Design an enzyme around this catalytic site. Structure first.
Site, mmCIF file in Angstrom:
data_model
loop_
_atom_site.group_PDB
_atom_site.id
_atom_site.type_symbol
_atom_site.label_atom_id
_atom_site.label_comp_id
_atom_site.label_asym_id
_atom_site.label_seq_id
_atom_site.Cartn_x
_atom_site.Cartn_y
_atom_site.Cartn_z
ATOM 1 N N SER A 1 2.440 -2.768 -3.241
ATOM 2 C CA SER A 1 1.731 -1.652 -3.919
ATOM 3 C C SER A 1 1.726 -1.904 -5.416
ATOM 4 C CB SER A 1 2.342 -0.295 -3.638
ATOM 5 O OG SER A 1 2.431 -0.031 -2.246
ATOM 6 N N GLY B 1 4.703 1.258 0.930
ATOM 7 C CA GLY B 1 5.376 2.002 -0.146
ATOM 8 C C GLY B 1 5.904 3.346 0.318
ATOM 9 N N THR C 1 0.870 -1.211 0.000
ATOM 10 C CA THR C 1 0.000 0.000 0.000
ATOM 11 C C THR C 1 0.890 1.239 0.000
ATOM 12 O OG1 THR C 1 -1.779 -1.144 1.168
ATOM 13 C CG2 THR C 1 -1.821 1.259 1.251
ATOM 14 N N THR C 2 0.603 2.192 -0.874
ATOM 15 C CA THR C 2 1.258 3.514 -0.943
ATOM 16 C C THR C 2 0.164 4.560 -0.911
ATOM 17 O OG1 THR C 2 2.832 2.571 -2.523
ATOM 18 C CG2 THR C 2 2.893 4.953 -2.175
#
Lengths: 244, 229
Positions: free
Chosen positions: B170, B131, B1-2
Site C-alpha cells: 500500500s 493493509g 492495497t488498503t
C-alpha cells in the site's frame, strides 16, 4: 395469403407492415416531438377516461437510459416491449464499449430489430412508432446537440427536426411544416418550440388541451438527462399558446 | 492495497490508498480503487485489479439497467447482494476483496464487506486489502462510532495513512469519497501531505544503534558516521 405472413404482395409491399402502421393510429393518441437550439421536447396525449385509473401509472414516455428518453405511439404493450429491447440494447452497448449508446445508434439498432420481424415469418411487428429523444455529443467541439430519432414498424429509422406519430399525425405535421416556413425551428428557445409542439397537438386533435391531458419529456444541453416536465411548467406553455 | 469504509450518521466514507504493485514494483502509483457503481454507491477494490474492475463494471452495468427499469434509486443492499453473487459464483477463479458502501434514502449509509469467500457482512465499518491487517488494532483503539462527516474523513485518511506506512503493498495518495444525501465529495490527499508517515514521526528520527564505532568500552554511544571518528 400475402396479407397474414411477412411476404411481398404482387405490388412489392409487405401488408403486415402496412397494418402495423395502422396499429400506431388505432389507439387515437398523438405525440409531437420538436428539437430547439438547446433542447428536445416530446409531447404525448395522456388521456385517462376512467376517473378510477391512476394517472401516474399510464405513461407513453419511458427512460431508455439516463440520457435517452423514448415515446411510444401505438399498442402500449408493444411499445413497452420495444423499450425493454432498447434498454437491453443500451445496457449491452454500455457493457461492450463502456460508453452510453448514442441515440442515432440505439435508433438504428431498434430499426434492425423491427426489420427482422418484417423478414422472418411468425413474429408480429411491434405496432408502435418509437420516438427516441436525447442530446448527442458533436465530436468536432464537444457541444451537445438535440436529436429526435423515430423507428417505425417497417424498421425505417430517421432523425427529425419535428415529428408527429398517432391519430392525426398528417394534420400535426401539416401544422409544423407551415410553422417551419416562418421560423428557423433550430434557432428557437425551449419555450417557443414547446408552444409550437403543444399548438400542433391542439390543432391536430382539434381541441384545447389541459396540462393533465399531456405528458412532456425533455432533454436540454444544460441538463442532458431525460426529464418528465412538471405539470406547472406545461401549464405556463398552454397559457402562453392560448394568448398568442 | 488498503481500503476501508466507515459509516457516519447521514452516510459513509470510503477511503483507499493508490498503489497497485506487481509484488515489489509499483505498476501504478495513482490508482482509484474507489469505483462508482451508482451515483451514491461505490465499491473499494482489493485483490486482482483485473478481477475487481471486471466485477465493478459488470455490477455497475446491472445496477444502471435496474435503476432505469424500476424508475427509482438503487439500495446499497442491492449493490452488495449483486456483488456477493458474482464474487461467490467465481470465488475460485477471482481474487477479490470488495467493500460495497453507499447511501440510499431507505437505509441511509451502509457498508458491506464482501471478502474473498463471497461472504457479505453488513457492518458499521469495513477494512480490506493487504493493509487491512494493520488497521484492525487501530480501529479497536482509536475508532469511536457516531463521528461527524468531517471527523470520519479525517479518521479514514489517518487510518489509510497508518496502514500504508507499514504495508509495502500500500502507498501513494489517500482517496476518500463521502456518500450521503448531498452530492458526493471525493478528495485526494497526496503522500507529501499525508496525516501520518513514519518518515516524519519524531518517534523514528533517532536511528537504531546498529553500526557502532570500535571502542574500548561496552557503553553503546551512537552509530559511526565518519571514518575519522
Amino acid at each position: 395469403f400475402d396479407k397474414y405472413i411477412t411476404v411481398f404482395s404482387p405490388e412489392g409491399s409487405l401488408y403486415q407492415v402496412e397494418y402495423a402502421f395502422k396499429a400506431v393510429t388505432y389507439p387515437g393518441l398523438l405525440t409531437v416531438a420538436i428539437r430547439c437550439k438547446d433542447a428536445v421536447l416530446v409531447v404525448t396525449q395522456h388521456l385517462i377516461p376512467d376517473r378510477l385509473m391512476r394517472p401516474d401509472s399510464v405513461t407513453a414516455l419511458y427512460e431508455v437510459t439516463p440520457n435517452i428518453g423514448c415515446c411510444m405511439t401505438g399498442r402500449a404493450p408493444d411499445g413497452r416491449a420495444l423499450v425493454q429491447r432498447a434498454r437491453e440494447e443500451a445496457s449491452d452497448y454500455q457493457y461492450r464499449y463502456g460508453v452510453e449508446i448514442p441515440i442515432a445508434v440505439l435508433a438504428k439498432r431498434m430499426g434492425d430489430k423491427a426489420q427482422v420481424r418484417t423478414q422472418q415469418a411468425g413474429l408480429r411487428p411491434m405496432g408502435v412508432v418509437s420516438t427516441f429523444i436525447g442530446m448527442d455529443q458533436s465530436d468536432q467541439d464537444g457541444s451537445l446537440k438535440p436529436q429526435i430519432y423515430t423507428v417505425d414498424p417497417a424498421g425505417w429509422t430517421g432523425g427529425h427536426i419535428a415529428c408527429a406519430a398517432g391519430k392525426k399525425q398528417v394534420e400535426a405535421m401539416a401544422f409544423l411544416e407551415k410553422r417551419q416556413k416562418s421560423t428557423e425551428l433550430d434557432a428557437l428557445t425551449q419555450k417557443e418550440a414547446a408552444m409550437i409542439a403543444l399548438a400542433a397537438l391542439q390543432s391536430a386533435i382539434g381541441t384545447a388541451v389541459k396540462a393533465k391531458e399531456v405528458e412532456v419529456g425533455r432533454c436540454t444541453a444544460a441538463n442532458p438527462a431525460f426529464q418528465r416536465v412538471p405539470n406547472s411548467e406545461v401549464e405556463e406553455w398552454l397559457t402562453a399558446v392560448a394568448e398568442a | 492495497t488498503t481500503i476501508l469504509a466507515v459509516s457516519y450518521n447521514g452516510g459513509v466514507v470510503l477511503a483507499a490508498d493508490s498503489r497497485t504493485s506487481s509484488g515489489t514494483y509499483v505498476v501504478n502509483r495513482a490508482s482509484n480503487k474507489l469505483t462508482k457503481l451508482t451515483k451514491k454507491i461505490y465499491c473499494c477494490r482489493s485483490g486482482s485489479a483485473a478481477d475487481t474492475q471486471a466485477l465493478a463494471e459488470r455490477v455497475s452495468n446491472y445496477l444502471g439497467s435496474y435503476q432505469t427499469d424500476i424508475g427509482a434509486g438503487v439500495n446499497v443492499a442491492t449493490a452488495a447482494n449483486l456483488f456477493q453473487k458474482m464474487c461467490y459464483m467465481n470465488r475460485w477463479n477471482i481474487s477479490a476483496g470488495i467493500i460495497v458502501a453507499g447511501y440510499d434514502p431507505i437505509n441511509g449509509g451502509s457498508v458491506y464487506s464482501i471478502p474473498s469467500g463471497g461472504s457479505c457482512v453488513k457492518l458499521d465499518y469495513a477494512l480490506g486489502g493487504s493493509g487491512s491487517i494493520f488497521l484492525y488494532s487501530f480501529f479497536d483503539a482509536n475508532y469511536k462510532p457516531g463521528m461527524s462527516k468531517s471527523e470520519c474523513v479525517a479518521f479514514c485518511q489517518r487510518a489509510v495513512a497508518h496502514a500504508y506506512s507499514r504495508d509495502g503493498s500500500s502507498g501513494g495518495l489517500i482517496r476518500t469519497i463521502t456518500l450521503d444525501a448531498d452530492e458526493p465529495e471525493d478528495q485526494t490527499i497526496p503522500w507529501n501531505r499525508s496525516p501520518y508517515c513514519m518518515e516524519k514521526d519524531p518517534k523514528y528520527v533517532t536511528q537504531a544503534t546498529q553500526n557502532q564505532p570500535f571502542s574500548s568500552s561496552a557503553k553503546i554511544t551512537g552509530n559511526r558516521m565518519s571514518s575519522t571518528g
